[PDB]
Symmetry: C2
Subunit: 49 residues, 2 copies
């Protein structure tokens, strides 16, 4: 490449990172920043296991 500060856009260097994920293939090990609550039972509730 010929990266020079004089060159306009379309030639200035750019940094690129691509992120790829799995889709529920095993016990997931990279979760989100959520707060696990207690464990209720015998009640009509909605869960996020």
């Amino acid at each position: 490449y010929g990266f020079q500060p004089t060159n306009g856009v379309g030639y200035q260097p750019y940094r690129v990172v691509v992120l790829s994920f799995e889709l529920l293939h095993a016990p997931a090990t990279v979760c989100g920043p959520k707060k696990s609550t207690n464990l209720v039972k015998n009640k009509c509730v909605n869960f996020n296991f």
Copy 2:
């Protein structure tokens, strides 16, 4: 000013310094990196006093 990294040439900021100086109108004090030598006498030489 509207300095943005996407701006083309002719709009990116430039740093400028101008140097002015008197042409020996008094005993000068700002010399260069030259080294003073010893003094000789009674011999035809050239000097930079």
